[PDB]
Scaffold this active site. Sequence first.
Site, PDB file in Angstrom:
ATOM      1  N   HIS A  42      24.963  23.584  39.577  1.00 54.34           N
ATOM      2  CA  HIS A  42      26.189  23.455  38.735  1.00 54.34           C
ATOM      3  C   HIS A  42      25.995  22.560  37.492  1.00 54.34           C
ATOM      4  CE1 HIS A  42      27.277  20.014  41.574  1.00 54.34           C
ATOM      5  NE2 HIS A  42      27.617  19.465  40.394  1.00 54.34           N
ATOM      6  N   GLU A  85      22.119  25.796  45.811  1.00 49.09           N
ATOM      7  CA  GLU A  85      22.673  24.769  44.886  1.00 49.09           C
ATOM      8  C   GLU A  85      21.594  23.825  44.351  1.00 49.09           C
ATOM      9  OE1 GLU A  85      25.491  25.352  43.625  1.00 49.09           O
ATOM     10  OE2 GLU A  85      25.771  23.470  42.445  1.00 49.09           O
ATOM     11  N   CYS A 128      26.974  13.462  41.838  1.00 52.25           N
ATOM     12  CA  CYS A 128      26.173  14.716  41.960  1.00 52.25           C
ATOM     13  C   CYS A 128      24.772  14.437  41.411  1.00 52.25           C
ATOM     14  CB  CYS A 128      26.872  15.948  41.383  1.00 52.25           C
ATOM     15  SG  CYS A 128      28.299  16.433  42.413  1.00 52.25           S
TER      16      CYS A 128
END
Length: 181
Positions: free
Chosen positions: A41, A72, A148
């Site tokens: 992302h 991911e 993140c």
Amino acid sequence: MGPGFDFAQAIMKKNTVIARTEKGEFTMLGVYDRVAVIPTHASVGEIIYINDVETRVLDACALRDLTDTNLEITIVKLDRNQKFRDIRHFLPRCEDDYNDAVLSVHTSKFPNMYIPVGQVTNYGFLNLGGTPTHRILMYNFPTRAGQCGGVVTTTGKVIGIHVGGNGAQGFAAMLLHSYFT
């Protein structure tokens, strides 16, 4: 504060950079050579900023399992003038659960941040931001925006990178030795 934080600090000091994309600033783990990882992302492009240095992306691969399911993790080769310390020998070979993990972050917002997250579950399947995702690790800490790319470690193992949370639990994508042959 103890030997978990000692291993985490050693990884952060030598094997992390601040990565900036059009989607924000992320902790980025360097694994070996000029190869690093970041959450998919982050939307890595042709150019990325690495500790505020404009850097060409030589290759970027968003990993999926052989079910063709999102993992991911994006593996990035960076057109840098320097190699990372090779830490592939600290990567797990298999999917597993863990005790006493630390999540470590280093960004402009959160420098020198270390969180004892405790027990880590092999959670497996997660609907992550609407996207079916496999190989998710879960810990019972209320992780926030800014974490993140954070590195998840135990003593002697680098086991994952933080990719999201639901306000009560945090979720990491597994790192496996097989991703970096």
